[PDB]
């Protein structure tokens, strides 16, 4: 059964409840993060609980418990689960916001579920994905607000997923880095602009294994004509192929071979960063 | 009188009302809300609150958890037991889950009551200045619970009341709030296709059309502001509150204005035809 970390108690997820006085209920002030498991280890933990700390400093949120806290409760939590876990941990903003612009009453709790990967069809056939001309805001800050990422989705066609395309600029998916293939290269947004997703470091890496190019630029909509593949990438997804974005075919409208490369190499490399 | 909260078909003591971390307001920012407010202890502008709500709930692609009817009857049932001025904030909730149907089909509801805390009479007197910001409110006819922004933004603000939503420079308007410049004695606002249709906003246009006040309904930009006689902002609890600079501008000869101090006394003399 799905369980909640709370209040210094593991709870089943249904039962678990926050006050309707906190801000992340009535502002949106939160913060929080995805963590999987392979092998029942948790994947680039410590960069994870880093992206954490980083959010919820940059949101002016004093951290309720430390780094080394959080780590137990997660290891604690994905032992209690027995099977490969997807861990959420949330910041909140609680009741206020001091005279010293600090949220200095978070609270705090970590989901744990059982993980769903994407259907295996959807590695083999790919997905669509929807752009908008908008920007996520604070862009390295993971906040909870994802209200774009369903909202916007009214006449998204059936989108796997959105895509934020400012002024025709790809920066990245609501729940993902966004990777384009154009002859042979990688393409993706730097972190200036895109969040500094643990999937996206680990494909960097690979990329430089491998002798393949990467430019860190926002690959534009209009180059999508001359891309061969593109892919989307996040620790529970791990590299799923794009094949439309829009009314616009990736290449020949089916995952490509540098795609199905790099996560077979993804795959095999991972051991090296589970905690 | 304590503050309430109506959840789960009961009034409770607001500290005692609490979500299940299920809720996608929770994990993903899914919420709309609105702010009503009593003069006279009677809710002021309800029914337009509430088809807000609903335009809120329904642009999000949340199906509403009750009738209109039913919010109307709880939030007179809450101030009816508050028996002071009363803040009523309806919220509507994603609920658990997004179908494949794309719509938000277990939505949740609770009504916030509490204590009106109106602005400072200072804030009145010596009015507030604002941080101007190159963003925008994402789906602005929807009012959203996400107000991240307007907190975070306040690492370089200045101590500003409130931020200004300020995209490539043209203003549409406060994170709480409707921007309103005065030039050449009358009015100039956004319109509602870039600013949400704020309560106030609405009063303000008709006590103006009441005036032969002219009202232009166009984004005022940044570079205008040097040329401006004054500013405010509205919002159901804060009426018409004075701006005196915006960013590092003077507006102004940088204290209220008497068109401003003219709008919030018929305002004030004129608040009870919109009550409910
Ligand atoms: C805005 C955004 N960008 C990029 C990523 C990719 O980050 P990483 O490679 O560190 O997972 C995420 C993860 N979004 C998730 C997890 C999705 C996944 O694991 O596939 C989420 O909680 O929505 C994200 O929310
Ligand atoms: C974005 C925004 N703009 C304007 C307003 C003012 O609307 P009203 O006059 O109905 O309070 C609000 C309400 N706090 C708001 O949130």
Sequence with gaps: MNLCYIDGKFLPLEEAKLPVTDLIIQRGVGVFETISTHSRRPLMLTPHLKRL?????????????????????????????????????????????????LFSSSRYFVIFAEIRKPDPIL???????????????????????????????????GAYEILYCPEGEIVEGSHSTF????????????????????????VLELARRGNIQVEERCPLLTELPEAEEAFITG????????????????????????????????????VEWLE
């Design 179 to 202: 990777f384009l293939i154009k002859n042979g290269h990688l393409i993706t947004a730097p972190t200036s602009r895109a969040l500094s997703g643990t999937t996206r470091q680990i």
């Design 53 to 101: 700390e980083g959010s919820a400093t940059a949101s002016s949120i004093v951290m309720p418990a430390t780094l080394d806290e959080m780590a137990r409760i997660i290891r604690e939590g994905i032992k209690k689960m027995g099977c490969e876990t997807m861990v959420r941990p949330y910041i909140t903003g609680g009741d206020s916001f001091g005279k010293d612009h």
């Design 235 to 270: 620790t529970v997804k791990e590299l799923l192929p794009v094949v439309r974005i829009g009314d616009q075919i990736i290449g020949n409208g089916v995952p490509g071979k540098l795609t199905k490369h790099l996560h077979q190499v993804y795959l095999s490399s991972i």
């Design 123 to 157: 590695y083999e056939k790919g997905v669509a994905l929807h752009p908008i001309n908008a920007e996520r805001y604070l862009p390295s800050t993971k906040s909870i607000n994802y209200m774009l990422s369903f909202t916007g989705q009214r006449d998204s066609k």
